[PDB]
């Protein structure tokens, strides 16, 4: 019934994703960000925070 696995298989899969890609990166280029930010607003008056 009980095996001897070292790293759970599910845990090992998330590790590669988080290491490969970081969801939030540099806190930098304020001017650059605004443009990215303004553009989204054109499509919609309302977007959820996430």
């Amino acid at each position: 019934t009980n095996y001897k696995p070292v790293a759970n298989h599910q845990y090992n899969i998330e590790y590669e994703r988080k290491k490969k890609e970081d969801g939030k990166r540099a806190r930098a280029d304020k001017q650059h960000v605004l443009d990215m930010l303004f553009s989204a607003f054109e499509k919609h008056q309302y977007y959820n925070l996430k």
């Binding site: 650059h32 443009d35 990215m36 553009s39 989204a40 054109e42 499509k43």
Partner: protein
């Protein structure tokens, strides 16, 4: 210039189809597609700029 005006007029003819389409959204889809590229273009601009600076 009047031929160009006629071409512009065709524009309004097909914008009628656009309304009927919405009444039935292609323009909206195109706009959405255009919105998506902006971010990729900026990313290319930063990395591309860095490459230009390098050489």
């Amino acid at each position: 210039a009047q031929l160009k005006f006629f071409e512009q007029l065709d524009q309004i003819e097909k914008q009628r189809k656009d309304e009927q389409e919405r009444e039935i959204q292609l323009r909206l889809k195109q706009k959405a597609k255009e919105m998506q590229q902006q971010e990729l273009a900026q990313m290319r601009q930063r990395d591309a700029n860095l490459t230009a600076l390098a050489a």
